[PDB]
Amino acid sequence: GMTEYKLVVVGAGGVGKSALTIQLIQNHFVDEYDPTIEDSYRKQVVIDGETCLLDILDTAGQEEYSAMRDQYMRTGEGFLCVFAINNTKSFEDIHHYREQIKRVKDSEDVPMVLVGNKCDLPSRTVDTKQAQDLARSYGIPFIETSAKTRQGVDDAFYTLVREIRKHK
Amino acid sequence: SNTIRVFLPNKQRTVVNVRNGMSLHDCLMKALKVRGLQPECCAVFRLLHEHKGKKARLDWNTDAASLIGEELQVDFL
Ligand SMILES: Nc1nc2c(ncn2[C@@H]2O[C@H](COP(=O)(O)OP(=O)(O)NP(=O)(O)O)[C@@H](O)[C@H]2O)c(=O)[nH]1
Ligand SMILES: [Cl-]
Ligand SMILES: [Cl-]
Ligand SMILES: [Cl-]
Ligand SMILES: [Mg+2]
């Protein structure tokens, strides 16, 4: 890719950051839960007619490894802020992750997309209105995803790239 | 807990968990496959703690449990 974009995936443990990333990179769903300490990926993709080199920085949800997360966040240009639609604390903690981004980037003006993952599950407990209101409160897009079915995966990452372009 | 840090081709990085009975090949297979990397095309080295000696070329059958706490480099052959 000519244009390189540094994308950071953040959010609470277990919400599906790595499964989303692996669906983007390799079109495969991981059903195991292997907690991340640090993982980075490169993927070339055409987005809006531009050949893009995406650096995907997939971070730990476990706060024990937040020092490593912060090193990845400092290099990133845009952030996928992921919660799971069956974990209300992960949704509430989007505020924590946004505050971390503001702290590490020393800026309140950072490209961000809200992602509500695991939408294939039954008995969803974080409803669409809650999620859209939270995204609205920060002026950011909200994308529903399922890493299992691949629904929304490209839209989530491509929307973040578009947000970075807007910001540039 | 029991992990290995691995520097990968194309500026990528992973930290892998080690489970009982894993060779180095087994331990890195997922991380390589997701990134389109075939282990047969790669060299793996154990990075040292001092600069006097040479980084140690590893066999794919090295037991991953013997490498816990180390940093490795995977490079294209
Ligand atoms: N049904 C379903 N399961 C999912 C989905 N995304 C992830 N999972 C499952 O949820 C578990 C955790 O996924 P994972 O991607 O490891 O989450 P993570 O946010 O990267 N965890 P960590 O912060 O520890 O690195 C795995 O068992 C995975 O299969 C999804 O969209 N639907
Ligand atoms: Cl291409
Ligand atoms: Cl750490
Ligand atoms: Cl808005
Ligand atoms: Mg993960």
Residue numbers in the entry:
A (entry chain A): 0 to 167
B (entry chain B): 55 to 131
Which sentences did the original study use to describe this structure?
The interaction of membrane-bound active RAS with RAF is the first step in the activation of this pathway. Active RAS recruits RAF to the membrane where RAF dimerizes and becomes active. The N-terminal CR1 region contains the RAS-binding domain (RBD) and the cysteine-rich domain (CRD), the CR2 region contains a 14-3-3 recognition site, whereas the C-terminal CR3 region includes the kinase domain and a second binding site for 14-3-3 proteins. Here, we present crystal structures of wild-type and oncogenic mutants of KRAS in complex with the RBD and CRD of RAF1.
